[PDB]
Amino acid sequence: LKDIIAAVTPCKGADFELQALKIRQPQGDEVLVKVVATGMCHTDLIVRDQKYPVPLPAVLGHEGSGIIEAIGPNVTELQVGDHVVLSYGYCGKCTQCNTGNPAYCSEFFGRNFSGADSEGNHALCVNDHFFAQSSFATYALSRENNTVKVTKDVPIELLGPLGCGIQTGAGACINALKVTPASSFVTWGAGAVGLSALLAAKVCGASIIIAVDIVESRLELAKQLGATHVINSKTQDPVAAIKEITDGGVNFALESTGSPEILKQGVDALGILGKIAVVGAPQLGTTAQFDVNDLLLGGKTILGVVEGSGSPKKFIPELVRLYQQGKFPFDQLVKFYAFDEINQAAIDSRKGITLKPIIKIA
Amino acid sequence: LKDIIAAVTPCKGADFELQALKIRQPQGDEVLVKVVATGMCHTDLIVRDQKYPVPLPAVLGHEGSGIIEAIGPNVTELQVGDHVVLSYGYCGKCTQCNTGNPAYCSEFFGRNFSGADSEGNHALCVNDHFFAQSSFATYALSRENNTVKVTKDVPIELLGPLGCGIQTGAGACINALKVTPASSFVTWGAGAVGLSALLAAKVCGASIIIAVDIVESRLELAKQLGATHVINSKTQDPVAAIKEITDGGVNFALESTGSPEILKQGVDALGILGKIAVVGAPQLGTTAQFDVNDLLLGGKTILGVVEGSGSPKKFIPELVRLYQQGKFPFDQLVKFYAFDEINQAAIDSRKGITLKPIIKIA
Amino acid sequence: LKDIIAAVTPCKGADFELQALKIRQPQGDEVLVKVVATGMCHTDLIVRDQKYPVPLPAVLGHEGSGIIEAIGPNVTELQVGDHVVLSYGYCGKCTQCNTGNPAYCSEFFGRNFSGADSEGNHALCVNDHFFAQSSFATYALSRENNTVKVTKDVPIELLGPLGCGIQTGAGACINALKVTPASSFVTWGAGAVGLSALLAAKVCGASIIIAVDIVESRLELAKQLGATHVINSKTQDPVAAIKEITDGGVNFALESTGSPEILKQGVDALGILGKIAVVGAPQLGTTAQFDVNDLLLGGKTILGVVEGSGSPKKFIPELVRLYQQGKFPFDQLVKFYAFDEINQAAIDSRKGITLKPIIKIA
Amino acid sequence: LKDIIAAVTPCKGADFELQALKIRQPQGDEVLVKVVATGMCHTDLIVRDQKYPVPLPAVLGHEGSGIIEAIGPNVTELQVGDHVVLSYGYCGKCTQCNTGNPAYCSEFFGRNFSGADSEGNHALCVNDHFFAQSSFATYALSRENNTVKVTKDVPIELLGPLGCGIQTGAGACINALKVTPASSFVTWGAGAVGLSALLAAKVCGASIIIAVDIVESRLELAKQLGATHVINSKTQDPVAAIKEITDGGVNFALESTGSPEILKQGVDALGILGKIAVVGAPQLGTTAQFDVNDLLLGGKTILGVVEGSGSPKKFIPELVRLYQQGKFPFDQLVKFYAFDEINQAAIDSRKGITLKPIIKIA
Numbered sequence A, B, C, D: 001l002k003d004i005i006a007a008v009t010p011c012k013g014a015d016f017e018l019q020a021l022k023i024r025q026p027q028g029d030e031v032l033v034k035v036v037a038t039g040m041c042h043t044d045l046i047v048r049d050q051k052y053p054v055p056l057p058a059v060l061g062h063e064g065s066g067i068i069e070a071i072g073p074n075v076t077e078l079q080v081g082d083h084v085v086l087s088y089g090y091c092g093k094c095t096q097c098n099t100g101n102p103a104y105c106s107e108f109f110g111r112n113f114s115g116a117d118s119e120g121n122h123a124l125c126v127n128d129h130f131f132a133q134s135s136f137a138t139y140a141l142s143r144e145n146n147t148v149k150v151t152k153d154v155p156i157e158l159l160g161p162l163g164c165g166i167q168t169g170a171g172a173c174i175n176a177l178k179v180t181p182a183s184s185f186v187t188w189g190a191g192a193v194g195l196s197a198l199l200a201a202k203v204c205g206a207s208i209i210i211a212v213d214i215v216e217s218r219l220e221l222a223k224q225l226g227a228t229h230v231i232n233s234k235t236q237d238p239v240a241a242i243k244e245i246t247d248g249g250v251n252f253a254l255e256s257t258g259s260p261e262i263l264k265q266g267v268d269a270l271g272i273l274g275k276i277a278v279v280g281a282p283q284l285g286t287t288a289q290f291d292v293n294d295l296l297l298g299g300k301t302i303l304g305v306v307e308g309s310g311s312p313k314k315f316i317p318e319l320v321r322l323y324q325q326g327k328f329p330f331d332q333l334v335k336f337y338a339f340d341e342i343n344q345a346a347i348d349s350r351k352g353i354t355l356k357p358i359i360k361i362a
């Protein structure tokens, strides 16, 4: 086995602290990865604060990128030295995995959120296997189906975030909603998820692209990214503004705040036959409201989306190619921090000055 | 012009009373119909009680069938003597009508619910043009696009209800949801709309077909129509029953009670990637709730449906053909009343002994 | 009635000649248009040469734009003075028109190709009603459903071609094929139809955009319009080139030459699960070949497309909006000629120096 | 290792002969199956006659059913004693396998047709691994992803054929074409594949169900299975008959003869917007013809289909459930033979008296 450094979250709300640990060699179709850098997402934070019961203590991080250092014996599609992006955790044998919907895997809450493996064994010597990677560390063990080979022609430290927040936002528009050329789209919330979606609606051809938030600097960045219209929902009624701008209501929408009352607003601002995709979440158990009659008479659709609905092994490489061509500049949401500044990376994202932090590890 | 007898609804909640009135000859693409019989629907009742502002006084009825007596000059697809079913009111020139979605016509609330025509002119000499027919009368004026030619080989008095409640229920399953072979389906509410949907899921191939209600005799009829499972939601927790029966949650569902708290139940009982279509309505302005997280993690879809989403000129004849073949026995929901018993037809549907009344007029 | 000048095609292969004729006022839902300019298409030429039996003599032209001068009495969506684009001819009452497929109207060969109206009456005083417009004239009579209102903010002489060749090419990609973001597309033939499709695949997000032709200047223009790759099929094996460029075969394709042997090439160059749309036509009765096994084992799709499959009343305005935004520069295929140079406009398109001619009439 | 009996095909066209061989224990995610019975398909025959280059000598059979006798160590979804159906061979890691299209796996010709494994190793001690099973033997080795658990409540000897011919025919209608309620369908060729499709169109709700063949007894069985119309294409022009019966052309079709000239007939008999799925194959390299203009003006679709396009792990159990309910009586195509009568089973299928043979082995 091997010794490594990893950031541990010791208890409800505790700060990340660096600790010395050990990781074993890979078996079956497992992969041993040398981590270069790992993105930081809202979800790592909500788990520390236990608004989700991942058992503590544990090693979090779910947006890793690195270099393969060792493959197991049944590994056939990856070799030592490949550059990879580590995405969420799926079984690939159930009904949803066999029909091209891994995000809906009947083992989704157990492979990413349990805190362990299939038996209760941990691969780190302390709970691990978080989103099947536990990547706030120098070394990570993943599975072949969640390890995505990417090109060596792009700096590898910048691509971790594609395994979660960027695919989630871009995917909601491309795979789930399917925005069409010449249509109107709006993103509720202008964080890294929303702005990823805004960049993808640009790629789909939409003619009207709107962003709604409460922090002014996030609204200025949206506009610089190509939002045709920006709206401050603290100072303006957003429903009324969206309806006048789109002459009746928007064709496509994204809810990324997780706020219930903003979510009703989002269903109300849809036009006839409009669709709203739901990616943000409130506390376990919260409900939201919608006006019945307005949804039934408008023929409106309300739909739930996990990780953008695609197949990551297919979609992740498509986003890297769109970026190399100059059509999807997600590198503009990023700011790099040192490993010993990981607690400061959390703070900046919560106050809104940093859209997408990336913990440099190697 | 011509003299006729029609049932008038004089004020909030008043009883239908027979009155002598006059109807003019048809113009442009209008059609003059001799009514044989007209179905009765919940919606005629909710308009009398003004939970919807159709201006009173007026002639209601929106499920008519009859014989063409006179066509206007630009009428090209119908001739004197054809047997017809009079469906809802659409413009056929807007964006939704031109793309095959007439139920979503941008003039839907004005052609059926205004109480008049495009200018304010009434064709009956008193508000008319209700669902573009006003068919509780011996004579009705409709438009060519809402007048559907059907075969003379089936008694014409039995087909009126296809212009609304039967198409609504059958259409939600066939056109909107699209139930697939070997799947699980549930109808919340076992009235004429629900039982029409249940009969259509049988046609689509579903292997598990469930019906939930509170009146026992409606649950016995469902089962005799081929429900694999029936559930009384006064005596049993319906969510728990649906989840155990379908091993995790139903693939497809229909909400036809209009009750908000039953509607949350319906979203909760869906399985992974399930879909629930909404056709029943509460009072103008009411909202309903759903659990966020459960909808987002299950990839659930919630969708609004008006009149089954098809094109009636295409779908209505398809239902008559399925019926003649013996595959869609909607005649089992019907009971005939005389024109002078129209007030009693309302009472029986509200207490649940009569599923679908048909006022015989000729 | 009114006197006008129109170009007549007197016999198999005869030259257009200007003649003095008369046009009547509009009835029912008919529209009287003052023509500003009319595009020229390959199809006008093939009808003169009678590879299609439109009865001669007659007034052709099927890509008109103008100003409304008079509306009939049942016209409700257009007024005197609107600027319009005159598209093909559809009934709007049959099964295909009622489901959002007017291009497939069961009266398609009779409304555009018969040479007359529903009865045999001609509106021009000599066969007319060609594509329901006969627009190589100072005045044209159309129907409300084929007359598309557009903005007064764009010169009206440039938009006629949107009623046929530009919608055909752009529509095959947007409505029929549905090209997806990051995919590979190829257009066989780089004339106005192909290059319209190439511009639309740019709008849909495709990462690889290929054009194949035999005239070098058309290949240079494609590349300047944003083709990633161009291929001369006289000098290079195009199948082999397309397969190496897309690492196995293209995802989406368009056949616009009408040449059978090029069409087999097009099915062979598709990759697994690829799709090829057919818009070009050979002589009535010609067949084409495909390799069976390759289509069955690759899961390939071969599909027929008329006028881009959309709804023109919806799609035409979407293209004008994409153009105003700077995302669909179809004005680069155009060259203007005087009315008395109409015979020279035919010659230039047949030799390939002119992509899309526009006969200026007003 | 273990000793067994298996039928070997020694050379171009040789007869099956029983031989004594040996099979090894399973590794990784491999499965050791005790075979009860194996269906016989046209494809076993075409490989013996080498119209496809599977290297001889080898053990064929590709429609097996049996009992699990041993699982490898990474096997998680199957246990010793389960009853299974062995379907075709897929990788489950490529782009097509990850998006829910295993039939289109980029390793399809190598996993079923190579004659060996990934390296050239054979598991039988002589070429094996045929359709990843080689099931004309008492023991078979398969992979976990091609081994489908089914219920112990149905005799296991009857279900092998579901791993190929029955799924192919039923799947073309349910997954690939998607026949809709009240539509018209036709199957060209009334063998086990066609009649499986005919039984599935019954399940999808079609109102008109046609079967075309040249052997009279196969046409009598179709009709007894519920074909509304039967046609002998030796004695009647089938195009003309199909067009008059469906008033213009059929909505959906299946080509299962592999005959090119019958395949053009099939595209000609489609009605506006019709679709024809291609499952039968001619010799490697053969082409077929279609009329261009008729396909382009009708908006017709021609599509290639392998093994019914579904996901077998999902679809196979759906067919067994439809059968138990009494809605898909595929047991009527079957006749059982002894293992030592396997050469006679080939003869009877080629002369058409036996629709689907099943070699009883245990």
Ligand SMILES: NC(=O)c1ccc[n+]([C@@H]2O[C@H](COP(=O)([O-])OP(=O)(O)OC[C@H]3O[C@@H](n4cnc5c(N)ncnc54)[C@H](O)[C@@H]3O)[C@@H](O)[C@H]2O)c1
Pocket: A041, A042, A043, A164, A165, A168, A188, A189, A190, A191, A192, A193, A194, A212, A213, A214, A215, A218, A233, A256, A257, A258, A259, A262, A278, A279, A280, A281, A305, A306, A307, A308, A349, A352, A355, B296
């Ligand atoms: N469903 C999935 O697969 C999935 C995966 C990724 C992220 N998540 C969730 O998606 C969300 C977005 O993540 P992110 O990285 O973009 O977070 P973020 O903090 O970067 O972005 C959210 C934005 O919402 C804005 N906001 C908050 N309250 C608001 C209000 N009342 N009105 C307007 N704007 C408001 C904030 O200003 C912020 O810019 C979080 O809920 C995250 O946990 C879901």
Ligand SMILES: NC(=O)c1ccc[n+]([C@@H]2O[C@H](COP(=O)([O-])OP(=O)(O)OC[C@H]3O[C@@H](n4cnc5c(N)ncnc54)[C@H](O)[C@@H]3O)[C@@H](O)[C@H]2O)c1
Pocket: A296, B041, B042, B043, B164, B165, B168, B188, B189, B190, B191, B192, B193, B194, B212, B213, B214, B215, B218, B233, B256, B257, B258, B259, B262, B278, B279, B280, B281, B305, B306, B307, B308, B349, B352, B355
């Ligand atoms: N969206 C549309 O196009 C459209 C058109 C038709 C009907 N409507 C609406 O659809 C509904 C159905 O019409 P219908 O003719 O079938 O009415 P109905 O009265 O015949 O049927 C509704 C059924 O709901 C049941 N129900 C009521 N409360 C219940 C509860 N708490 N739990 C269980 N069951 C309960 C009743 O027992 C009854 O059988 C009405 O709301 C009607 O106005 C909508």
Ligand SMILES: NC(=O)c1ccc[n+]([C@@H]2O[C@H](COP(=O)([O-])OP(=O)(O)OC[C@H]3O[C@@H](n4cnc5c(N)ncnc54)[C@H](O)[C@@H]3O)[C@@H](O)[C@H]2O)c1
Pocket: C041, C042, C043, C164, C165, C168, C188, C189, C190, C191, C192, C193, C194, C212, C213, C214, C215, C218, C233, C256, C257, C258, C259, C262, C278, C279, C280, C281, C305, C306, C307, C308, C349, C352, C355, D296
């Ligand atoms: N289906 C419909 O609705 C519809 C409507 C519009 C146009 N049409 C047909 O579509 C076609 C395209 O019209 P267009 O205006 O673009 O015509 P065009 O003459 O401008 O373009 C066709 C191109 O094909 C190229 N070509 C011809 N033979 C070739 C070969 N062997 N190899 C490579 N390239 C070759 C020519 O160089 C030319 O550039 C014509 O057949 C027209 O009649 C169909």
Ligand SMILES: NC(=O)c1ccc[n+]([C@@H]2O[C@H](COP(=O)([O-])OP(=O)(O)OC[C@H]3O[C@@H](n4cnc5c(N)ncnc54)[C@H](O)[C@@H]3O)[C@@H](O)[C@H]2O)c1
Pocket: C296, D041, D042, D043, D164, D165, D168, D188, D189, D190, D191, D192, D193, D194, D212, D213, D214, D215, D218, D233, D256, D257, D258, D259, D262, D278, D279, D280, D281, D305, D306, D307, D308, D349, D352, D355
């Ligand atoms: N694409 C796939 O995944 C796949 C898998 C299974 C079967 N196959 C192929 O599908 C086909 C069907 O297999 P099957 O078991 O049903 O074979 P079969 O022999 O049982 O059936 C084919 C039928 O075609 C009929 N036929 C032959 N020539 C005819 C003609 N000219 N006119 C009319 N009828 C004619 C025969 O009478 C026979 O009944 C074969 O080509 C087989 O190899 C394809």
Ligand SMILES: [Zn+2]
Pocket: A090, A091, A092, A093, A094, A095, A096, A097, A102, A104, A105, A106, A107
């Ligand atoms: Zn899974």
Ligand SMILES: [Zn+2]
Pocket: A041, A042, A043, A062, A164, A165
């Ligand atoms: Zn995340």
Ligand SMILES: [Zn+2]
Pocket: B090, B091, B092, B093, B094, B095, B096, B097, B102, B104, B105, B106, B107
């Ligand atoms: Zn309308």
Ligand SMILES: [Zn+2]
Pocket: B041, B042, B043, B062, B164, B165
């Ligand atoms: Zn009604």
Ligand SMILES: [Zn+2]
Pocket: C090, C091, C092, C093, C094, C095, C096, C097, C102, C104, C105, C106, C107
């Ligand atoms: Zn039509």
Ligand SMILES: [Zn+2]
Pocket: C041, C042, C043, C062, C164, C165
């Ligand atoms: Zn044209």
Ligand SMILES: [Zn+2]
Pocket: D090, D091, D092, D093, D094, D095, D096, D097, D102, D104, D105, D106, D107
């Ligand atoms: Zn594969």
Ligand SMILES: [Zn+2]
Pocket: D041, D042, D043, D062, D164, D165
């Ligand atoms: Zn087979």
